[PDB]
Design a protein around this motif. Structure first.
Motif, PDB file in Angstrom:
ATOM      1  N   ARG A 203       0.844  -1.182   0.000  1.00  0.00           N
ATOM      2  CA  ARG A 203       0.000   0.000   0.000  1.00  0.00           C
ATOM      3  C   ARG A 203       0.886   1.242   0.000  1.00  0.00           C
ATOM      4  O   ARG A 203       2.029   1.219   0.487  1.00  0.00           O
ATOM      5  CB  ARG A 203      -0.951  -0.028   1.196  1.00  0.00           C
TER       6      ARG A 203
ATOM      7  N   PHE B 175       1.032   5.627   0.415  1.00  0.00           N
ATOM      8  CA  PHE B 175       0.423   6.847   0.927  1.00  0.00           C
ATOM      9  C   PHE B 175       1.272   8.061   0.580  1.00  0.00           C
ATOM     10  O   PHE B 175       2.497   8.043   0.760  1.00  0.00           O
ATOM     11  CB  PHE B 175       0.204   6.756   2.436  1.00  0.00           C
TER      12      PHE B 175
ATOM     13  N   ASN C 250      -4.378  10.638  10.106  1.00  0.00           N
ATOM     14  CA  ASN C 250      -3.511   9.863   9.231  1.00  0.00           C
ATOM     15  C   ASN C 250      -2.813   8.748   9.997  1.00  0.00           C
ATOM     16  O   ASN C 250      -2.583   7.666   9.441  1.00  0.00           O
ATOM     17  CB  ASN C 250      -2.486  10.786   8.563  1.00  0.00           C
TER      18      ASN C 250
ATOM     19  N   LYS D 219      -5.044   5.705   9.982  1.00  0.00           N
ATOM     20  CA  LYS D 219      -5.056   5.038   8.682  1.00  0.00           C
ATOM     21  C   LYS D 219      -3.777   4.241   8.450  1.00  0.00           C
ATOM     22  O   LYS D 219      -3.821   3.122   7.930  1.00  0.00           O
ATOM     23  CB  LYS D 219      -5.257   6.051   7.552  1.00  0.00           C
ATOM     24  N   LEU D 220      -2.619   4.818   8.786  1.00  0.00           N
ATOM     25  CA  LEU D 220      -1.358   4.107   8.586  1.00  0.00           C
ATOM     26  C   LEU D 220      -1.240   2.885   9.494  1.00  0.00           C
ATOM     27  O   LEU D 220      -0.713   1.846   9.078  1.00  0.00           O
ATOM     28  CB  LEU D 220      -0.190   5.061   8.805  1.00  0.00           C
TER      29      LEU D 220
ATOM     30  N   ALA E 223      -3.295   0.172   7.875  1.00  0.00           N
ATOM     31  CA  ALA E 223      -2.607  -0.336   6.695  1.00  0.00           C
ATOM     32  C   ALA E 223      -1.417  -1.203   7.085  1.00  0.00           C
ATOM     33  O   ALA E 223      -1.155  -2.234   6.455  1.00  0.00           O
ATOM     34  CB  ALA E 223      -2.141   0.841   5.831  1.00  0.00           C
TER      35      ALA E 223
ATOM     36  N   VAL F 276       3.871  -1.057   3.667  1.00  0.00           N
ATOM     37  CA  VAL F 276       3.204   0.234   3.543  1.00  0.00           C
ATOM     38  C   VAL F 276       4.278   1.257   3.198  1.00  0.00           C
ATOM     39  O   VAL F 276       5.262   1.398   3.937  1.00  0.00           O
ATOM     40  CB  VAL F 276       2.465   0.613   4.832  1.00  0.00           C
TER      41      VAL F 276
ATOM     42  N   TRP G 204      -7.747   6.788  -6.626  1.00  0.00           N
ATOM     43  CA  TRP G 204      -8.353   7.101  -5.338  1.00  0.00           C
ATOM     44  C   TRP G 204      -8.424   8.592  -5.050  1.00  0.00           C
ATOM     45  O   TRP G 204      -8.973   8.987  -4.010  1.00  0.00           O
ATOM     46  CB  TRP G 204      -7.647   6.366  -4.198  1.00  0.00           C
TER      47      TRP G 204
ATOM     48  N   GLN H  19      -3.149  11.002   1.644  1.00  0.00           N
ATOM     49  CA  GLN H  19      -3.939  10.412   0.564  1.00  0.00           C
ATOM     50  C   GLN H  19      -3.372   9.054   0.148  1.00  0.00           C
ATOM     51  O   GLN H  19      -2.175   8.923  -0.144  1.00  0.00           O
ATOM     52  CB  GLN H  19      -3.936  11.371  -0.628  1.00  0.00           C
ATOM     53  N   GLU H  20      -4.219   8.025   0.129  1.00  0.00           N
ATOM     54  CA  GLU H  20      -3.750   6.741  -0.364  1.00  0.00           C
ATOM     55  C   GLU H  20      -3.610   6.784  -1.877  1.00  0.00           C
ATOM     56  O   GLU H  20      -4.413   7.418  -2.580  1.00  0.00           O
ATOM     57  CB  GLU H  20      -4.653   5.576   0.064  1.00  0.00           C
TER      58      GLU H  20
ATOM     59  N   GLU I 182      -3.442   4.404  -5.222  1.00  0.00           N
ATOM     60  CA  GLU I 182      -3.797   3.073  -5.707  1.00  0.00           C
ATOM     61  C   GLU I 182      -2.550   2.289  -6.123  1.00  0.00           C
ATOM     62  O   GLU I 182      -1.529   2.862  -6.508  1.00  0.00           O
ATOM     63  CB  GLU I 182      -4.794   3.219  -6.866  1.00  0.00           C
TER      64      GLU I 182
END
Length: 158
Positions: free
Chosen positions: A13, A15, A40, A43-44, A47, A54, A116, A129-130, A132
């Motif tokens: 993934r 970011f 954030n 979210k991290l 992930a 990541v 995304w 922001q992730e 894709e």
């Protein structure tokens, strides 16, 4: 070569990290750490538990470039030596392993759009922001190779 890099990026993934000043990115390159706002951070952390790798891709605002990319080696934690970030409230500290400390100008990523983020050019996006999978992989492969880094060590953490 790019083979170990591609192995590290397999099913990762990605970011986008937007920093307001070069000094924080320099500190992160020197100390192998990053810290972000709690939205954030959450979210991290999710992930990090969900994926083999990541990858954070760093850009200093106004610079017109990315400054490199790194792989999360830990979830966020509190209670280390205080990092003297230049502040503009922070969450924990993530340990990161740099994969490339070289810069990439936005002019070189103009063909890469991020599904995304409304398929806008990948340089465009808020901090956190992730990106894709395919766009993020191709973006990392655009960076000049960083011959100072040995990905054998990074592979040993997946």
């Amino acid at each position: 070569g790019t083979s170990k890099l591609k192995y590290v990026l397999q099913d990762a993934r990605f970011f986008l990290i937007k920093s307001n000043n070069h000094e924080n990115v320099s500190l992160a390159k020197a100390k192998g750490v990053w810290s972000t706002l709690p939205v954030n951070e959450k979210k991290l952390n999710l992930a990090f538990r969900s994926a083999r790798s990541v990858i954070l891709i760093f850009s200093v605002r106004e610079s017109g470039k990315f400054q490199g990319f790194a792989r999360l080696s830990s979830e966020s934690h509190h209670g280390g030596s205080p990092i003297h970030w230049v502040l503009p409230m922070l969450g924990g500290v993530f340990k990161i392993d740099w994969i490339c400390r070289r810069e990439l100008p936005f002019t070189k990523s103009a063909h890469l759009t991020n599904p995304w983020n409304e398929h806008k050019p990948v340089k465009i996006g808020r901090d956190g922001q992730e990106i894709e999978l395919e766009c993020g992989t191709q973006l990392c492969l655009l960076f000049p190779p960083d011959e100072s880094i040995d990905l054998y060590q990074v592979i040993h953490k997946m």
